[PDB]
Design a protein around this nucleic acid. Structure first.
Ligand SMILES: N[C@@H]1[C@@H](O)[C@H](O)[C@@H](COP(=O)(O)O)O[C@@H]1O
Ligand SMILES: [Mg+2]
Length: 90
RNA sequence: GCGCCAGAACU
RNA sequence: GGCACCAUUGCACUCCGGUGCCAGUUGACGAGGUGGGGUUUAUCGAGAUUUCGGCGGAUGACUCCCGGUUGUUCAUCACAACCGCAAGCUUUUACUUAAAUCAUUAAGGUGACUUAGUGGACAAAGGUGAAAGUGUGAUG
């Protein structure tokens, strides 16, 4: 269902860890205040990002507005997080 | 036990 | 660590896919040490994944010299150890800021690491102060 964290995939893998993290904050800041954006370049986690919002309302607005948006020459694919994040759950 | 850095090791 | 190529469209919350090329970083912690030449593997502990390995230096050692000093009064010689502004040797102590490692804290770096601090200390060789026993022979 809905979640404080949104799962993003289909991201450009050629972009380094912190540059992506800062460019993602550049867009998702308008929907609500972001707690953290978790990015990893491992085989299992590359081209993926976890933006953690404080409110669920900010996650839904981000999911609705940024879906299919071209980001680094690639259209974004946004879902909700399957489970809560460690900053939200604990 | 003083200086350097084509190996080696580490990132 | 970058960069390139290949593989990868996944649901994470501590650093984790291959392959090449190209960089970067470390790389001796103090204590002590220089009459001239020759030869050489250049003293002492502390620490310990590299204080490894390679290059350069080097006050060491050995040996032949030059010049001294001691060899328990003096001098000339040979002989032994010793000094090189010091000086026979065995034998005891104390003193001569140990520093780094270790433990941490800040600053810088993507990182390996770098710089600067702080804390606790811990040597040996040499040298010196003082305490014990002995130094070669022949001689004008
Ligand atoms: N004091 C040291 C010597 O003890 C050592 O013999 C020399 C050579 O260094 P290495 O150990 O690299 O041969 O360097 C220094 O001079
Ligand atoms: Mg040094």
């Amino acid at each position: 269902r809905p979640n404080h964290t949104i799962y993003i995939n289909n991201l450009n893998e050629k972009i380094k860890k912190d540059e992506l993290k800062k460019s993602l904050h550049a867009i998702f800041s308008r929907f609500g205040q972001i707690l953290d954006i978790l990015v990893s370049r491992s085989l299992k986690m590359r081209g993926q990002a976890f933006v953690i919002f404080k409110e669920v309302s900010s996650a839904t607005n981000a999911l609705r507005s940024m879906q299919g948006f071209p980001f680094y020459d690639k259209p974004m694919r946004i879902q909700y997080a399957k489970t809560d994040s460690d900053i939200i759950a604990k």
